[PDB]
Amino acid sequence: KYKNIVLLKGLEVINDYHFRMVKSLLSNDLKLNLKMREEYDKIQIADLMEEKFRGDAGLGKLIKIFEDIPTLEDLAETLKKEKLKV
Amino acid sequence: KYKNIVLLKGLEVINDYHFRMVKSLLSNDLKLNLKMREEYDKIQIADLMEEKFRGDAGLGKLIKIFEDIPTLEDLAETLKKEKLKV
Amino acid sequence: KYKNIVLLKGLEVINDYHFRMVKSLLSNDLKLNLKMREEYDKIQIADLMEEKFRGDAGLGKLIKIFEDIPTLEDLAETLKKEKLKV
Amino acid sequence: KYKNIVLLKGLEVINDYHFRMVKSLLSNDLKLNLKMREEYDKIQIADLMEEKFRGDAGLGKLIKIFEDIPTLEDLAETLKKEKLKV
Amino acid sequence: KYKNIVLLKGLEVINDYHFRMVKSLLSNDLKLNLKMREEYDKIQIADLMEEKFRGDAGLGKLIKIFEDIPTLEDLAETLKKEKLKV
Amino acid sequence: KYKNIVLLKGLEVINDYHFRMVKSLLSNDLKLNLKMREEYDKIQIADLMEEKFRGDAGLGKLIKIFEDIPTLEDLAETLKKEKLKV
Amino acid sequence: KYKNIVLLKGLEVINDYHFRMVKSLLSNDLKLNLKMREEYDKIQIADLMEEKFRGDAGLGKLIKIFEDIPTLEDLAETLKKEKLKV
Amino acid sequence: KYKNIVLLKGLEVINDYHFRMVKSLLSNDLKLNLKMREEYDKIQIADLMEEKFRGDAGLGKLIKIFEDIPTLEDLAETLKKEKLKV
Amino acid sequence: KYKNIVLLKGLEVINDYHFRMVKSLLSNDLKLNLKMREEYDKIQIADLMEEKFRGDAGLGKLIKIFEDIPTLEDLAETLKKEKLKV
Amino acid sequence: KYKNIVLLKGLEVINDYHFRMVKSLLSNDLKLNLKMREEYDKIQIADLMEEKFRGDAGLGKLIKIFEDIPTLEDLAETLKKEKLKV
Amino acid sequence: KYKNIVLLKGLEVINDYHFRMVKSLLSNDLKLNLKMREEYDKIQIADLMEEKFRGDAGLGKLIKIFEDIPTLEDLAETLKKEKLKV
Amino acid sequence: KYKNIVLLKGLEVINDYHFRMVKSLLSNDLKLNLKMREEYDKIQIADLMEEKFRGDAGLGKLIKIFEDIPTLEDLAETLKKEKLKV
Amino acid sequence: KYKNIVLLKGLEVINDYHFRMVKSLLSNDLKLNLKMREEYDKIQIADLMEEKFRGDAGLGKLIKIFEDIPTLEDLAETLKKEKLKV
Amino acid sequence: KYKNIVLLKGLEVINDYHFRMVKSLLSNDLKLNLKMREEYDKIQIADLMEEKFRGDAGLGKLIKIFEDIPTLEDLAETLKKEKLKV
Amino acid sequence: KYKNIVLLKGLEVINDYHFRMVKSLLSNDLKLNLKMREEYDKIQIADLMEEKFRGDAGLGKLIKIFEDIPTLEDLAETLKKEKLKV
Amino acid sequence: KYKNIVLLKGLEVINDYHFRMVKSLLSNDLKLNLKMREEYDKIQIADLMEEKFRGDAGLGKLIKIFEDIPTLEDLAETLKKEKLKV
Amino acid sequence: KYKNIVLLKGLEVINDYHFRMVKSLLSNDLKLNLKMREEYDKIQIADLMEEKFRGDAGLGKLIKIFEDIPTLEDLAETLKKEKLKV
Amino acid sequence: KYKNIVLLKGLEVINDYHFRMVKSLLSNDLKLNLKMREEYDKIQIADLMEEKFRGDAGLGKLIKIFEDIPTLEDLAETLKKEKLKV
């Protein structure tokens, strides 16, 4: 149920600019070309995360990204709490 | 008559974005491959839920999914009320 | 003459998507297997309803199905008026 | 001569889908069992209508059937004109 | 010679379905019971026409039937041409 | 005179399929072997029924057979009318 | 020797269906009643042909009949060749 | 009288598709070769079943077949009722 | 004894369609005219095989025909086994 | 007495088609020419079998022929029972 | 032998759609009227082609037809190989 | 050989959507009523065009139809080239 | 030839959104029910126009509809030119 | 023709944001659930307006809504002029 | 009784798409040519499997086919249970 | 068993867009005309692959196609694993 | 194999906005009407390039288009490298 | 090729505000309503301009507009150079 956390409590609590920043930061880690960089959305990004990051469905890397963003530090802590719960 | 709740008062009220959300979230619990991710519509998704979630026709898991969606919290409460009525 | 209403003023007025909805929702009430889900058309479905719903030829159950569909509320009212007439 | 109109200008102008639908709608009025619904063609259906509807060879009930069919409304009017002619 | 036209250029140019339809339409005009409806072939039907339609051996009524058959309109014209030839 | 009804207005009105059907259904009641069931025509069948069914010359059992055959229900009614006439 | 062509190379080559065609078409030309049309075989038909058609033993009319039969056009040509030989 | 039911109420009430399926499913129990599989009709199939299933004229096995046929479950129940009547 | 195989295990096991192919493909080898092509039945055809194929009563050519028919390949193998037995 | 079984319980129980089968298959064993093939009836065939098959009056070979006929296997068993009876 | 290729490896390998296409394309070359287009099966069609195309029993024209059908190009090549073999 | 081009390089190369468009556009020129519009396939449509457009078997009119279709301009040019070749 | 203009130069040039607009605006003038709005494609919509708008096959009303759509003003002018030509 | 004004001169002159505002303001008056808020386009909205606002096809309420929006006051005046014209 | 499971509980439950899948996948294992792929229905396919897969009447290979189909996994499990029962 | 992999683990896991890509890229390698582009489904496409790519049943070319599609890289690896297994 | 480059390394790497730009720029060189401007996706557009730009399947013109797009200069260089490779 | 210059070297280089001023200044010359003021992007604007400014695809008036903008004077000179080149 790691995809539930990364999709509901993750990419869908942050705004569009932060989602674009997350996509750009994980473009190399998900092999996102030009089309996927601007066309893919939160559902498709989470599905690709699960497909390529089966260990934790990309929750760890999402938390690491959210740590560096000052606006999303609280959300990173919440995601850490969710991961500890599950 | 649970599938009449998950299909009429459930997947149909939600827009296409939230339906894709649900399909992605329930992909592991419904064994949806790449084709079923984008091809199956609400009728076939509800039928597959009834086939694989015979205990509650997927209504409980749909309500749990809708709880974490800020937009569909009211719909989750309505589905809870419908389930209690049935 | 109840099958006349449920066929010509019923399934024949709704599109293929709503017809698939009706076939799925009445699957338990008509014992439709996988083949009947994707092969039976409006004529066969109406005949099967009349066979298994001899009390009202499935017109009433179709009416409750159409009530929950926001698009077919007017058709549900029309079917109610037709049932009252006959 | 009524059977000439109900066959040549009737069942033989409408397609197979409408022919099956007519056969279903007249199953109770013609006592068609499972074999007759899926086996009888337009010739034998017209003959049975003439046998069991000697008043008008089934032309009138065919016209009332065609009235509710939006596609065959023009053919219903043509059948009315033919009946008025004869 | 009129029986030559109705049997050679007539009932034997049309297929079995059209021959059955002709037999059904002329059932009242030839007093065909159940047996003769599906047992008499083209030879016996033409003989019965000549027996009961001695004015024209049924050629006129066969042409009238063929006129309403869109598939056999050309054959109706050919039969008319042959009749005016003889 | 019951032979006249059962032959002229009976077996001679039904087609070959229904005659073979009657022969099969009356095989036990007429002790028809392999040769008789396949080779005997309507005349010999009526004569044998008169010989073995002297109470009503087989008219009652033929009517009972014709009752259950939907194509021959009208002929069964006609045979009943003939029986009450005679 | 005209009987040999019309019989051995004529009616004895066509099947029973085409022979019944020939018997029916020449019923007026041979004065064949109900029994003669349905009982006479090819030998007696050829004998009656010679009896009533002394000019050519019925070969010319048989060829004319075979001309209009599409299946027997080759046989008609063969009969023409035999007549030219004789 | 068991054959009197399996023919009127059985193989003839079902369509040709179901009759062929019945013939295939009873091929081993009736020793039907290649010819008899698609040459034997309902009358001959019923006669063969009565010959080889003298205990119940094949009514029990026909009911067992009809049961697993979703379309013919009602006919199976009717056959059970008729057997109990006999 | 070879006629016992070509008839009982040969033409009498195949249906009417396969028998018509057999009669057809052997028209040149059996000098079958228009009449014999659709009049001769299995007994007469087998007798003609024995008359004109004294070497093996036509069993070899029948097996060769059955080889190219995919439906009757098993029957061809059975005929080969019977020939090796005798 | 063996002639009684082969005639009364034998050839006279099978139909004309199977009788022609028997005549053709026994043509070599009975020296049946062209005339005897389609002129000798069951009485004459049984008499010739008794004249030529004095060991068992042809009962054994008739049973062997009936074994290969799927329709007459039951009659072959009956003839075997009669032979062991006598 | 050219019939063997055109029938067993020819019209009988293609489905009913392609067979109707062939009958249609050969209607002018075989003089098939309205009846023969919708009634003639593969046996009678092949016999007619041999009768009218004695040079190669219509194998060349069938191969030319099959060339233009993309689905039957492999079958056309196989027929060419068979023709070169024979 | 004009029907060969219109059926092979014509209607068979275009998809079902374009075939339905062609059938609709030629409905007035072919007198296609309601049944033929949704029932006739490419083989029967080509035969009807040849019957009613004997000057060019409908190839020219098909070319003019294909000219206005942007997808089938290349096929229209190919059909023009084929017509110039023949 | 007005339907050739309204279809090829009309509905087939506009995209799906404008086609749905044409269907919706002409719903009252064509009596399109709920099914017909979401099911009928350009071929069937044009055929229905020609059936119900025999004066100009619906070209005038299509042009009037296209006038108010800013995107399709050029197509409206082109259709006006086509109508003036025809 | 009120649907023509509300669609072509109405929702299609306003941009996407104003259309969303119109949909949100008429959510209660049209019973639009969450799916219809974000999925229904101008064609579907106009059709629903005609279905539920048959008095003026929603033109009056659309004009009232446009009055409150300063950007669309000119469009509201134009729609008033169009309503006065029709 | 293995053919009972593979037919009634097997191919008759799947829709036409999955049946075509089964026919294509078993083409090499059943030697189905071009005609057999597009013409055989469930009855004749089941008969062919029983003929060629005598070890398990094709039930095992059908189960392995149904395993890889995500839609028919439940049907594969049901067929496994049926095989274990028998 | 290569066609099993290319169908069940190949085209049946990818959606309609990827399947249209597949058919498109291999149009030259499969000689798919305009009809085959939009009509052939996965079963017919896989059958044509096996017919024209007997070396690997089209599995290898499908793998090279899936390699270039970023969404189907995992499925390409799975197909490579399946090929290595078989 | 140039369609593979223009489709996989080309139009599918670019986002939807750049694909619309490419469709616009190649509209004159591909004769794209109003429908194809907004309806044709990447598969259809690449196929149209192959049909109309057989020299290089439109790869050269696509590269020229990508040169003027600052975002897609790297993709233009990659396409040049692919063309040099193939 | 004037559209390539106006779209790539023109509207694609200027930012959003300059493009909005270009759309506002060209609104009268392009007949853009309220929706087209904001919704239309550079691709659609360039298309429209080609449609209505066929003399130079809008390059001349775009250059004239860019002349008055001090920021885009260099781009205006570059567009003049491109026009002179082409």
Side-chain angles (χ1 to χ4, degrees), chain C residues 7-24:
Chain C
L7 185 52
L8 307 182
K9 322 291 220 308
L11 309 158
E12 281 266 330
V13 186
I14 71 156
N15 49 1
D16 180 64
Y17 182 80
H18 294 136
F19 177 54
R20 279 155 32 78
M21 211 176 258
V22 171
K23 274 189 305 184
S24 159

Side-chain angles (χ1 to χ4, degrees), chain C residues 61-76:
Chain C
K61 202 156 310 300
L62 198 74
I63 281 173
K64 273 73 62 183
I65 301 299
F66 284 1
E67 276 179 352
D68 290 333
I69 303 165
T71 310
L72 309 170
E73 301 256 30
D74 200 2
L75 203 54

Side-chain angles (χ1 to χ4, degrees), chain C residues 19-69:
Chain C
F19 177 54
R20 279 155 32 78
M21 211 176 258
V22 171
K23 274 189 305 184
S24 159
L25 294 155
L26 272 73
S27 160
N28 290 318
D29 291 331
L30 288 179
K31 286 191 269 320
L32 307 154
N33 53 359
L34 301 83
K35 167 176 72 74
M36 291 155 137
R37 293 278 192 59
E38 278 90 3
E39 301 276 70
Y40 273 30
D41 43 8
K42 298 150 181 191
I43 297 89
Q44 298 161 19
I45 284 296
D47 293 338
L48 178 46
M49 262 180 286
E50 193 197 12
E51 277 179 9
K52 309 188 65 63
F53 290 147
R54 292 180 179 91
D56 63 358
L59 192 51
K61 202 156 310 300
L62 198 74
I63 281 173
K64 273 73 62 183
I65 301 299
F66 284 1
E67 276 179 352
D68 290 333
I69 303 165

Side-chain angles (χ1 to χ4, degrees), chain Q residues 47-83:
Chain Q
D47 291 332
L48 192 59
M49 276 179 224
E50 184 175 69
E51 300 319 321
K52 311 185 65 61
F53 287 163
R54 292 180 179 91
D56 43 18
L59 195 55
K61 210 168 302 302
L62 198 76
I63 285 174
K64 174 162 311 313
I65 288 300
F66 281 3
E67 275 178 352
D68 289 333
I69 303 166
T71 312
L72 310 174
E73 293 179 353
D74 201 3
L75 202 54
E77 305 301 327
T78 305
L79 288 190
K80 290 181 181 179
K81 274 154 62 46
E82 269 313 306
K83 166 185 288 190

Side-chain angles (χ1 to χ4, degrees), chain M residues 1-37:
Chain M
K1 281 322 175 54
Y2 284 161
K3 183 173 72 175
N4 204 336
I5 304 299
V6 65
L7 188 51
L8 270 297
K9 326 288 216 304
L11 313 160
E12 280 267 337
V13 184
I14 59 160
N15 50 0
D16 181 65
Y17 186 80
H18 294 137
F19 177 52
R20 277 156 32 77
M21 196 160 260
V22 160
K23 274 190 303 184
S24 158
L25 291 154
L26 270 72
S27 161
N28 290 318
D29 304 0
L30 292 179
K31 286 191 269 320
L32 305 151
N33 60 7
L34 282 72
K35 169 180 78 75
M36 261 166 278
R37 294 221 204 81

Side-chain angles (χ1 to χ4, degrees), chain P residues 18-58:
Chain P
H18 302 134
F19 176 55
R20 277 157 35 77
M21 260 182 297
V22 165
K23 289 188 293 180
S24 166
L25 295 149
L26 280 74
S27 161
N28 294 115
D29 291 331
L30 291 180
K31 287 191 270 320
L32 306 153
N33 58 2
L34 301 83
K35 179 194 53 143
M36 293 180 183
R37 294 281 191 51
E38 282 93 4
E39 291 305 90
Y40 282 16
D41 53 7
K42 300 154 181 193
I43 296 90
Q44 300 158 20
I45 281 298
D47 283 358
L48 183 63
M49 298 210 158
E50 195 206 18
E51 271 190 2
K52 311 184 63 62
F53 286 163
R54 254 171 301 290
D56 53 38

